[PDB]
């Protein structure tokens, strides 16, 4: 391929907390190789999730934009079954996580929840019908 | 889990479909495609364009109202001379460079742009 996406990062307040909700979730496994001070990334079997420090703003000349509020992304997490959607979703209100919308069938076709992460970015837990 | 989709929730899911194909050459995904959406495959998780419709469906309305950015999209590319080329290959589709390429001190070979509606990517090379 001409380009791949390799990584999706967010920008957090605390990477390791971060980092830790994802793991305990949907036990994704941290790639050590990559760690700084300023960054975790997890391993998901296609694009990897990173969680980059406040540091990470300056660094790339975008301090002007960080001051956030609102959402603007999110991330879509599929699993095998209906029934690993129901179960998952505790799961991840336990960790840290904020239901936003229950279990329920899309226009499309697909059976998700809609929640927030620790610090109020948007996932779902997927399945497709 | 899978992580099959990244989303951006976008004001013109058209425009921002076709800036990302014609940067990165990322082909649409027609079985996903509606009128409030569209999907581009790009070899691992598929980039996701939902129109501001999708913030009701998902209850998420209290929500729409954004500022700044908490996100970024990293594309790899295969040599450093190619970071050097796509970059004008970006401003031209329609992107902003905030950070020309150069190195870090762990040696990746990188740019810093926005796209046309202000969200963040980099093109990069793992020297």
Same mark, same amino acid.
């Given at each position: 391929?001409?380009? &791949?996406?390799?990584?999706?990062?967010?920008?957090?307040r605390d990477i390791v907390a971060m980092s830790a909700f994802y793991q305990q979730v949907f036990? =994704?496994?941290?790639?050590?190789?990559?760690?700084?001070?300023?960054?975790?990334?997890?391993? *998901?079997?296609?694009?990897?999730?990173? !969680?980059? #420090?406040?540091?990470?703003?300056?660094?790339?000349? %975008? #301090?002007? =934009?960080?001051? *956030?509020?609102?959402?603007? !992304?999110?991330?879509?997490?599929?699993? &095998?079954?209906?029934?690993?959607?129901?179960?998952?979703?505790?799961?991840?209100?336990? #960790?840290?996580?904020?239901?936003?919308?229950?279990?329920?069938?899309?226009?499309?076709?697909?059976?998700?929840?809609?929640?927030?992460?620790?610090?109020?970015?948007? !996932?779902?837990?997927?399945?497709? %019908?």
């Open positions: 391929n001409m380009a &791949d996406l390799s990584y999706v990062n967010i920008f957090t036990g =994704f496994q941290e790639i050590e190789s990559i760690r700084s001070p300023i960054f975790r990334g997890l391993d *998901t079997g296609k694009s990897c999730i990173g !969680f980059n #420090a406040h540091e990470a703003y300056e660094l790339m000349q %975008l #301090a002007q =934009f960080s001051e *956030t509020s609102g959402i603007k !992304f999110l991330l879509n997490f599929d699993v &095998d079954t209906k029934e690993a959607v129901d179960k998952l979703v505790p799961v991840a209100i336990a #960790a840290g996580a904020t239901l936003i919308k229950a279990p329920y069938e899309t226009y499309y076709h697909w059976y998700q929840a809609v929640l927030l992460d620790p610090e109020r970015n948007v !996932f779902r837990i997927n399945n497709v %019908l």
